[PDB]
């Protein structure tokens, strides 16, 4: 296993956002041309095993451990009735105190805040990606497509990401092979070598959140200089067309940096190889 491996994301110009927004309130529009310098992106979401190496090295206590709770989705035992703040839910205990990660070492780490993610990435000689870097990487060398692989959800009749099937939130059929998370190396890679960039765990980025974007061309944009919420991308194993249609590269959402939940993780980036 090489679950901390990085891939080179080539220099290029891409269209960020879309002029056909599907969730207009999230500022998916307008489409804008962004230039990104070559850099490196983690192939995989950070796994439990990789996060444990960080904790073993540093002794780091995550914010959820310090606060004493984190958000867990009801269907696997708030902003919605299906989100419960559970005492003792944290990265080692993803559904609460009597859950464990022993049987899912290769699944993405969860219940990690933006600060937790920045601590890990920096420990590793890396950083969080910007939203623009993230989206560029998600798109995997294709222009103006819904998903990393194209516009069809199940190309060639194959599942390409871990999201929800069935009637959310009552019934997840597990048609794609996973009710909760999947290993970080599950499903096909995109054109750049990235796994689970949409679906599985949501992913933190470095940017502060705004929904107000200029159409102006930009170079290595960092997002606005201030804010209250940081940007997350890509959707999760909970996402579905019917309620949280955010397993698209253009999609975007946000949380306060001290937030944590059972569907939110991250991957790192770096200017050069560490």
């Amino acid at each position: 296993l090489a679950h901390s491996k990085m891939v080179p994301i080539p220099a290029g110009v891409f269209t960020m956002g879309t002029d056909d927004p599907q969730i207009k309130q999230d500022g998916e529009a307008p489409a804008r041309r962004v230039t990104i310098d070559a850099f490196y992106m983690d192939a995989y979401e950070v796994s439990n095993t990789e996060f444990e190496k960080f904790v073993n090295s540093t002794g780091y206590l995550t914010e959820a451990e310090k606060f004493g709770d984190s958000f867990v989705f009801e269907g696997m035992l708030a902003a919605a009735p299906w989100w419960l703040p559970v005492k003792g839910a944290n990265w080692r205990h993803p559904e609460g105190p009597d859950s464990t990660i022993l049987h899912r070492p290769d699944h993405p780490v969860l219940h990690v805040s933006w600060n937790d993610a920045v601590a890990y990435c920096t420990w590793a000689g890396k950083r969080l990606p910007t939203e623009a870097e993230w989206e560029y990487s998600c798109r995997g060398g294709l222009h103006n497509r819904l998903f990393p692989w194209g516009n069809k959800l199940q190309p060639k009749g194959q599942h390409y990401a871990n999201i929800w099937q069935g009637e959310f939130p009552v019934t997840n059929t597990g048609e794609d092979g996973f009710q909760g998370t999947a290993p970080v190396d599950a499903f096909p890679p995109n054109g750049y070598g990235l796994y689970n960039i949409v679906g599985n765990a949501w992913e933190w980025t470095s940017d502060w959140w705004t929904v107000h974007h200029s159409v102006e061309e930009t170079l290595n944009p960092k997002g606005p200089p201030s804010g209250k919420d940081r940007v997350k991308k890509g959707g999760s194993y909970m996402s579905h067309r019917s309620y949280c249609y955010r397993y698209r590269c253009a999609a975007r959402s946000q949380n306060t940096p001290d937030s944590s939940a059972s569907n939110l993780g991250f991957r790192c980036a770096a200017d050069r190889l560490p």
Partner: peptide, 5 residues
Amino acid sequence: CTPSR
């Protein structure tokens, strides 16, 4: 999709 703390 994820509630804030």
